Every structure is written in C-alpha cells, then in structure tokens.
Design a protein around this motif. Structure first.
Motif, PDB file in Angstrom:
ATOM      1  N   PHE A   1       0.781  -1.223  -0.123  1.00 47.19           N
ATOM      2  CA  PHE A   1       0.155   0.034  -0.012  1.00 47.19           C
ATOM      3  C   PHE A   1       0.949   1.311  -0.030  1.00 47.19           C
ATOM      4  O   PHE A   1       0.528   2.192  -0.872  1.00 47.19           O
ATOM      5  CB  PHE A   1      -0.895  -0.012   1.175  1.00 47.19           C
ATOM      6  CG  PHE A   1      -2.096  -0.997   1.120  1.00 47.19           C
ATOM      7  CD1 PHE A   1      -3.130  -0.665   0.508  1.00 47.19           C
ATOM      8  CD2 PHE A   1      -2.020  -1.982   1.721  1.00 47.19           C
ATOM      9  CE1 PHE A   1      -4.195  -1.427   0.408  1.00 47.19           C
ATOM     10  CE2 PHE A   1      -3.130  -2.994   1.548  1.00 47.19           C
ATOM     11  CZ  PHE A   1      -4.254  -2.798   0.921  1.00 47.19           C
ATOM     12  N   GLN A   2       2.126   1.160   0.818  1.00 47.43           N
ATOM     13  CA  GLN A   2       2.751   2.470   0.960  1.00 47.43           C
ATOM     14  C   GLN A   2       3.505   2.855  -0.251  1.00 47.43           C
ATOM     15  O   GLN A   2       3.744   4.141  -0.649  1.00 47.43           O
ATOM     16  CB  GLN A   2       3.560   2.234   2.256  1.00 47.43           C
ATOM     17  CG  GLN A   2       3.013   2.133   3.568  1.00 47.43           C
ATOM     18  CD  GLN A   2       2.235   1.123   3.535  1.00 47.43           C
ATOM     19  OE1 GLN A   2       2.812  -0.065   3.201  1.00 47.43           O
ATOM     20  NE2 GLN A   2       0.987   1.176   4.263  1.00 47.43           N
TER      21      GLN A   2
ATOM     22  N   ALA B   1       9.809  10.823 -15.552  1.00 44.02           N
ATOM     23  CA  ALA B   1      11.051  11.376 -15.090  1.00 44.02           C
ATOM     24  C   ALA B   1      12.284  10.492 -15.183  1.00 44.02           C
ATOM     25  O   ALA B   1      13.408  11.051 -15.524  1.00 44.02           O
ATOM     26  CB  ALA B   1      11.025  11.700 -13.509  1.00 44.02           C
ATOM     27  N   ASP B   2      12.246   9.256 -15.342  1.00 40.15           N
ATOM     28  CA  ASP B   2      13.197   8.066 -15.336  1.00 40.15           C
ATOM     29  C   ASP B   2      13.558   8.256 -17.086  1.00 40.15           C
ATOM     30  O   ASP B   2      14.767   7.865 -17.278  1.00 40.15           O
ATOM     31  CB  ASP B   2      12.987   7.048 -15.285  1.00 40.15           C
ATOM     32  CG  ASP B   2      12.734   6.840 -13.605  1.00 40.15           C
ATOM     33  OD1 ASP B   2      13.278   7.722 -12.904  1.00 40.15           O
ATOM     34  OD2 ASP B   2      12.077   5.871 -13.015  1.00 40.15           O
ATOM     35  N   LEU B   3      13.080   8.779 -18.067  1.00 39.44           N
ATOM     36  CA  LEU B   3      13.234   8.454 -19.418  1.00 39.44           C
ATOM     37  C   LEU B   3      13.907   9.884 -19.981  1.00 39.44           C
ATOM     38  O   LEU B   3      14.065  10.366 -21.096  1.00 39.44           O
ATOM     39  CB  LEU B   3      11.847   8.562 -20.162  1.00 39.44           C
ATOM     40  CG  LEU B   3      11.175   7.178 -20.271  1.00 39.44           C
ATOM     41  CD1 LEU B   3      10.730   6.759 -18.842  1.00 39.44           C
ATOM     42  CD2 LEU B   3       9.931   7.238 -21.109  1.00 39.44           C
TER      43      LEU B   3
ATOM     44  N   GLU C   1       4.071   7.208  -2.806  1.00 41.45           N
ATOM     45  CA  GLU C   1       5.075   7.532  -3.788  1.00 41.45           C
ATOM     46  C   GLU C   1       4.530   7.773  -5.188  1.00 41.45           C
ATOM     47  O   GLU C   1       3.055   7.671  -5.329  1.00 41.45           O
ATOM     48  CB  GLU C   1       6.336   6.349  -4.187  1.00 41.45           C
ATOM     49  CG  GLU C   1       6.887   5.948  -2.919  1.00 41.45           C
ATOM     50  CD  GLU C   1       7.969   7.287  -2.455  1.00 41.45           C
ATOM     51  OE1 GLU C   1       8.657   7.467  -3.367  1.00 41.45           O
ATOM     52  OE2 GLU C   1       7.658   7.744  -1.476  1.00 41.45           O
ATOM     53  N   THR C   2       5.276   8.270  -6.143  1.00 32.98           N
ATOM     54  CA  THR C   2       4.597   8.492  -7.528  1.00 32.98           C
ATOM     55  C   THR C   2       4.459   7.291  -8.335  1.00 32.98           C
ATOM     56  O   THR C   2       5.135   6.390  -8.150  1.00 32.98           O
ATOM     57  CB  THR C   2       5.519   9.531  -8.276  1.00 32.98           C
ATOM     58  OG1 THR C   2       6.893   9.193  -8.329  1.00 32.98           O
ATOM     59  CG2 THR C   2       5.657  10.898  -7.574  1.00 32.98           C
ATOM     60  N   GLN C   3       3.507   7.311  -9.325  1.00 33.17           N
ATOM     61  CA  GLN C   3       3.218   5.960 -10.057  1.00 33.17           C
ATOM     62  C   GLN C   3       3.492   6.515 -11.614  1.00 33.17           C
ATOM     63  O   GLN C   3       4.013   5.819 -12.588  1.00 33.17           O
ATOM     64  CB  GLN C   3       1.798   5.424  -9.876  1.00 33.17           C
ATOM     65  CG  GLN C   3       2.000   4.979  -8.310  1.00 33.17           C
ATOM     66  CD  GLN C   3       3.013   3.705  -8.280  1.00 33.17           C
ATOM     67  OE1 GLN C   3       2.989   3.012  -8.986  1.00 33.17           O
ATOM     68  NE2 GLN C   3       3.669   3.996  -7.215  1.00 33.17           N
ATOM     69  N   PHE C   4       2.874   7.684 -11.976  1.00 30.34           N
ATOM     70  CA  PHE C   4       2.939   8.357 -13.309  1.00 30.34           C
ATOM     71  C   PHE C   4       3.930   9.285 -13.521  1.00 30.34           C
ATOM     72  O   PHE C   4       4.868   8.940 -14.441  1.00 30.34           O
ATOM     73  CB  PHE C   4       1.661   8.862 -13.505  1.00 30.34           C
ATOM     74  CG  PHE C   4       1.189   9.286 -15.061  1.00 30.34           C
ATOM     75  CD1 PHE C   4       1.046   8.567 -16.251  1.00 30.34           C
ATOM     76  CD2 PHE C   4       1.625  10.957 -15.375  1.00 30.34           C
ATOM     77  CE1 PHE C   4       1.037   8.924 -17.377  1.00 30.34           C
ATOM     78  CE2 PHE C   4       1.365  11.302 -16.376  1.00 30.34           C
ATOM     79  CZ  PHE C   4       1.224  10.428 -17.583  1.00 30.34           C
TER      80      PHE C   4
END
Lengths: 49, 49
Positions: A31-32, A45-47, A37-40
């Motif tokens: 759940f945490q 941001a990783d790309l 945290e971010t999902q979308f």
C-alpha cells in the motif's frame, strides 16, 4: 506439596467446525509503495536522455 | 581499594501460602508410679504363760 493456594480456574469447552470447502486467499501488500510515492510522473522522469 | 563489595539483607517472606509452618506443638503426658513397700517389723517377745 508444600504450599496452599486458592486456584480459581476457568475451563473452556467448545469446538470450531467448518462446513463449506470454499475460500479465496489473497496476499495484499505494498500500500505505501503506491499511495506514498509517484506512479505516473515519477516514471516519466526516468526517461531523460 | 575503598569500595563497598557486598551486602546482606533482612528480607523475609510473607507466608500467605503457609509454605513454612514453623515449630509444632503437641500435648504429651508422662506417668510416674510409686509403689509402697512393706518394711521390716519390730517385735517384742513375751512368754505365753
């Protein structure tokens, strides 16, 4: 054999019995990691080249 | 070497469980017997006539 104590004892007398041989079991975790945290945008941001 | 090395306490139990019963008392009786003996006589002779 060498001391006297008043012992007030409660003795359970019961049984749990199952009837229906049916269940679905799920292990729900993380759940945490999703709500905290971010999902979308965190993934976009990783790309960055 | 000035220091406190050890100690002794006067700690005692509370025999609410009556683990220790201490000394015992009982009633007793003795018998002494004093029989009375006969003792040697004293006599005086006199003639019969």
């Amino acid at each position: 054999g060498h001391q006297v104590t008043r012992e007030i004892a409660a003795i359970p007398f019961n049984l749990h019995v199952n009837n229906i041989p049916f269940a679905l079991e799920f292990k729900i975790t993380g759940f945490q990691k999703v709500m905290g945290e971010t999902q979308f945008n965190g993934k976009l941001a990783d790309l960055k080249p | 070497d000035l220091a406190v090395i050890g100690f002794e306490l006067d700690t005692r139990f509370t025999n609410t469980n009556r683990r220790q019963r201490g000394h015992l008392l009982q009633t007793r009786a003795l018998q002494f017997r004093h029989p009375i003996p006969m003792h040697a006589p004293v006599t005086l002779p006199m003639d019969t006539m």
